Design a protein around this nucleic acid. Structure first.
Lengths: 63, 50, 106, 50, 77
RNA sequence: UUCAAAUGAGAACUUUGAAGACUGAAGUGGGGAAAGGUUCCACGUCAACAGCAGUUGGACGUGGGUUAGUCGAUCCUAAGA
RNA sequence: AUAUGGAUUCUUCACGGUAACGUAACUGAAUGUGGAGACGUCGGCGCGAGCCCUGGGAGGAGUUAUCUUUUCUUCUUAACAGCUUAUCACCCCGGAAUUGGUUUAUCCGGAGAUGGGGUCUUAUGGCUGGAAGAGGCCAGCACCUUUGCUGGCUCCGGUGCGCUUGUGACGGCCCGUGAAAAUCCACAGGAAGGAAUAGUUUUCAUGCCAGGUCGUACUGAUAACCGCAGCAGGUCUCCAAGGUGAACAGCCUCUAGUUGAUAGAAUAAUGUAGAUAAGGGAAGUCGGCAAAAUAGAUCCGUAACUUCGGGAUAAGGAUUGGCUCUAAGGGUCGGACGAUCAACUU
């Protein structure tokens, strides 16, 4: 528990301790899918609440 | 302590008088069996000499 | 809002024998109990009050029955009274110190 | 085995009842040639081959 | 097992004349999280299934015990 | 691996307790298929067997134990016969 | 097998909904047609279960030289039944270029999208019944007894690229496109059969009776199988905890299970297994055989040749602990911001 509590703080985290590739530790695809879903459903609620119009929504979706 | 010590001790029943020193009424037969059981070695011969 | 919680420790069978005393126990509790950090803060969050037969503690603040059991066994080890006395619950928030089994010598 | 035929089971039953040493009353008979059981079996030593 | 809500439907099952035995049951529970109250459960042994009736109020429960037929066997707890 | 007590003629090896370690959930764990067929379990008991020992045993002697409309077989067809 | 209840019928073989379809029911022979049974593997993505992790409270156990509102443990809910719930799919309204919707993955729309309102499957989940009477954790009496007897508590939550597994809708792959049959149901058809003084429905409900034969113990292997043996060999499969870590690697632990392998006393040479060595650094040897050295990760950097795909972790460099901070990266709700809750990455 005490080691888990220091890992929350950002301790025992550094280059010496790590023994796996960045992908092995946190996959790049997961980082994309978290990110891309978050950018998606931001643009969903802006469209339906009506800050943004539907024409600009369609451009930003593909960007 | 003394309340317990005077409570705990015993009358000594009749069974202690007759079966204190005594043991082994009906002795253990040679196979090591119960009263109704059968033992096919020694069903045939009756008697300890034979 | 806060809602107080009475806790009642009997100490009859220890005290009549005279290995144990309520007065030192009620003295030991009232300083060593902790609220919101550290010891010796407790004005009106709690009120430790011995009768003689039964000790009573009532807590509007954060306090639990396990923490009362904790501080008693802490006190009992201080007197070398663990191995011969134990903290027991008879009913909910209703506790009492009972001697272990102990056979007679004869 | 733990999922036997009846026939296989039937032959275990005959094999169980045969598995016994000699009755002692047969020792005492007039002109007793027979001393011990010569066709006795044990699970470890000899496989009955069903 | 099969719950019944309705009170009229329970009285029909007692007169159905396969039902040899019933049983009554009493449970302590706490309403909302405010106070305790004394629940009851009138169960009746059908041939296929066990029909049952949950009454929350204690006043309605005591009239229901009388409202059973006498010829039916009843068994407490 | 060690210490005591118990049992017994006899204990480095049986039993209980007290310690010290090991397998370390890809097990020295809990269940099964094939195959074995009573090895399961109790009581009695040590001539032979257990490459030392033996009061112990999968050994020796006598018993007990396997309960199905719903788990299987049975029924269906496969390559094939 | 039948018999009561309900339903249906004098418009004889039910009504409702625009429709998807709905309900407690709501005749049906020959024959025919259809579905289920009925099926590859790999990939990520969603949903569920079990486990893991975690907080409050009620008990129990340990620690206490000093410190610790502390460490460990118990707080569970089966099949079955009745209500209710979901992606896909489908129906109605309506008519889209200023093209829009939308998945992690770019497929869809005048063969009718977006949008609004519906209908359906019930994997799975939820709620009550089963069911607390059960089970679990505690407390106290009776006492040669092979013995009972009586009290409590069994509550309310949280988290996720977690692990195992089940399932859904998709995507990739092929000169491979990944069993059959029993069995069950439905649909088309209408042979014919049923009422007005009582029939038709045993696919709605409740009730009555019946269910044979054989297997079932135990091992499943460093002692129960096969190797002439109580043989370091061989022999198909399910379950699968905590930490370190990329990891069902190695190392240490919990539950469960062993503590079996002939011992004792010394510590010569020679062996078997394993190590270290000043200076030199292959002079050894047929031969660098065998050891030594290198090794994980991050950033810089990377030649010849090439079938342009590779070669490539080429080669060659700079780093890595501990601590205390800083910075960025989300969710949730009600209308320029604010409150509050959480993950371990860089």
């Amino acid at each position: 528990r005490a080691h888990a509590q220091s890992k929350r703080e950002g301790r025992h985290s550094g280059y010496g301790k790590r023994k796996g590739t960045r992908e092995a530790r946190l996959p790049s695809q997961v980082v994309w899918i978290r990110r891309l879903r978050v950018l998606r459903r931001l643009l969903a609620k802006y469209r339906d609440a009506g800050k943004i119009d539907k024409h600009l929504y369609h451009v930003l979706y593909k960007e | 302590q003394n309340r317990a010590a005077r409570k705990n001790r015993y009358v000594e029943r009749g069974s202690d008088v007759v079966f204190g020193d005594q043991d082994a009424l009906t002795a253990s037969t040679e196979n090591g069996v119960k009263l109704r059981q059968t033992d096919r070695l020694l069903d045939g011969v009756a008697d300890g000499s034979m | 809002q806060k809602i107080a919680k009475t806790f009642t420790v009997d100490v009859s069978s220890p005290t009549e024998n005279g290995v144990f005393d309520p007065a030192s126990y009620a003295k030991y509790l009232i300083d060593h109990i902790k609220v919101e950090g550290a010891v010796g803060n407790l004005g009106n969050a709690v009120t430790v009050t011995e009768d003689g037969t039964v000790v009573t503690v009532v807590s509007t603040a954060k306090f639990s029955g396990k923490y009362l059991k904790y501080l008693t066994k802490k006190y009992l080890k201080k007197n070398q009274l663990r191995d011969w006395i134990r903290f027991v619950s008879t009913k909910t928030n209703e506790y009492r110190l009972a001697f272990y089994q102990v056979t007679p010598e004869e | 085995a733990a999922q036997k035929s009846f026939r296989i089971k039937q032959k275990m039953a005959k094999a169980k009842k045969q598995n016994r040493p000699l009755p002692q009353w047969i020792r005492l008979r007039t002109n007793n040639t027979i001393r011990y059981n010569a066709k006795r079996r044990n699970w470890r030593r000899t496989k009955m081959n069903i | 097992a099969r719950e019944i809500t309705d009170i009229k439907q329970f009285l029909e099952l007692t007169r159905r004349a396969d039902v040899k035995t019933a049983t009554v049951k009493i449970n302590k529970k706490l309403n909302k999280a405010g106070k305790p109250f004394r629940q009851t459960k009138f169960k009746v042994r059908g041939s296929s299934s066990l029909y049952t009736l949950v009454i929350n109020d204690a006043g309605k429960a005591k009239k229901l015990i009388q409202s059973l037929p006498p010829t039916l066997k009843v068994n407490r707890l």
